[PDB]
Design a protein around this ligand. Structure first.
Ligand SMILES: CCCCCC[C@]1(C(=O)O)CC(=O)Nc2ccc(Br)cc21
Length: 133
C-alpha cells in the first residue's frame, strides 16, 4: 500500500519553467519545442513490490518499472541513457538520474487532488501539475 495515493491515470494540467529545465539538462532546440507542447497521460500502477510509471503523449510513450531503492537503466524521453534510483522519502517519490557525470532529481508528491512533479537540475526547477484523468 506504499504508493496507494499515486496509483491511477493522471493528465498534465500545468507546467512552469520546463523549457529552462530542459536547457539545463542539455535537451536540443527541436526536442524542447516538441516535448514542451506535449500533454502527457501518466499512468502509475503497483503489483507487489514493482511500481510501473508510464507516460503517454504525442511526443513519446515511455515506461519504467522498478523496485524502490534498486537502481535501473532508463532511456529518458529526450533519449538520455541514465542510471536511475527511486525511493520514497516522507511520502514523496524521489527519482535521481545519473549520466555523464551529471544528475537530476524528479520528485512526485500528492497535494490535494493533484500529483505535483518537480524536476530539478542545478538551480533550475520545473513544476508540472497533473490531475486525475
Ligand atoms: C524531457 C525530459 C524531462 C521530462 C521531465 C518531465 C516528465 C513529466 O512531466 O512527467 C518526466 C517523466 O517521467 N516523463 C515525461 C515524459 C514526457 C515529457 Br514531455 C515529460 C516528462
Amino acid at each position: 500500500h506504499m504508493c496507494d495515493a499515486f496509483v491511477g491515470t493522471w493528465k498534465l494540467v500545468s507546467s512552469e519553467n520546463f523549457d529552462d529545465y530542459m536547457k539545463e539538462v542539455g535537451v536540443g532546440f527541436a526536442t524542447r519545442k516538441v516535448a514542451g507542447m506535449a500533454k502527457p497521460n501518466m499512468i502509475i500502477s503497483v503489483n507487489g513490490d514493482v511500481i510501473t510509471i508510464k507516460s503517454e503523449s504525442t511526443f513519446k510513450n515511455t515506461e519504467i518499472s522498478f523496485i524502490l531503492g534498486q537502481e535501473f537503466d532508463e532511456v529518458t524521453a529526450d533519449d538520455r541513457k541514465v542510471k536511475s534510483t527511486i525511493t520514497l522519502d516522507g511520502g514523496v517519490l524521489v527519482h535521481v538520474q545519473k549520466w555523464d557525470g551529471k544528475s537530476t532529481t524528479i520528485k512526485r508528491k500528492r497535494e490535494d487532488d493533484k500529483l505535483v512533479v518537480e524536476c530539478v537540475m542545478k538551480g533550475v526547477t520545473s513544476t508540472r501539475v497533473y490531475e486525475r484523468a
